[PDB]
Amino acid sequence: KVTTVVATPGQGPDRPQEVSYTDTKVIGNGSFGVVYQAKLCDSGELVAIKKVLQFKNRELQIMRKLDHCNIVRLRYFFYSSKKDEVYLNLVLDYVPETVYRVARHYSRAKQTLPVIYVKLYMYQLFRSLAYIHSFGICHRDIKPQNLLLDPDTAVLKLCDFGSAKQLVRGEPNVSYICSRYYRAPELIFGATDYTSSIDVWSAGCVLAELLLGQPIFPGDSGVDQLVEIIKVLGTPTREQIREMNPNYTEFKFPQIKAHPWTKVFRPRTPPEAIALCSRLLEYTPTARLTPLEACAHSFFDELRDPNVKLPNGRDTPALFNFTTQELSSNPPLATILIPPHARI
């Protein structure tokens, strides 16, 4: 069946137009709603359609603002029909794979993801985070399942803005957010005044998971999530508790020292990957690297080499096409992030 709908372009203008698609199939179903795969009749291009029961949709208002090579682009949006039931459909660029599926493959085969892919995926993830954080947008669901991949080009695109929120200081936010294994400790402590640094904690969990071949903090519950963190970071200090949640107080508790980072990972783990990870998985939210600072980390130096290639021999995807928006947290950093061979 060929489906014809009146849809509005994702970025501009607000001029609705007829869009026709075919080859419709369910590719995902969850609490959020349903995700379909379809083919646009006009260009033969593949699309993902995220259908949500729908007040204005927070996810749509965020998606309409974004245009970045490491973020799944919102091509169109259309409403469909109890009949009081209204569904919002987000027509997104299609991406065939996820970091979850790719990492699972290597894990099942008992082999580590090659270091070049760890650098490429993590660098693209930090770029997508530098971009959204510059608008005050926090994703709040950074996990391998939300990291889409083009297996041939090694392009990574951040998806699923269903948990995302534009954070405003002094306006409270829900603490029970983010998939458990990737949940920042300040969220476990019940913080409602947290910042976009919760996404950097989650990005550090993805990195460690890529180095280990399994999640670093596999909590079996909310409390067990903190147990898993303490096994690595030890107990937080009174000052770190205040930095995580100033509303939380605990006068007495047994002090546990951190486990050495070098023993958390397998012996052959690249020491620069461990160093980077130690600067992301910190109790103090403000001590975590910003995404732009993480892109400039020496672990990503191989990506800035002019002779760098994928193991399949293809060239690396676009890594240096930075915009003023993306560089806004620290504009002078541009001269370090954009190597001489990449400049016009």
């Binding site: 409390v223 107990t235 107080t249």
Partner: peptide, 23 residues
């Protein structure tokens, strides 16, 4: 979670997590 809410309200979260380390 209902247990977590309780530990956060009672200020016993770290103590209980340390106990669960088993210990």
């Amino acid at each position: 979670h209902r247990l977590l809410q309780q530990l956060v309200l009672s200020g016993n979260l770290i103590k209980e997590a340390v106990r669960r380390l088993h210990s």
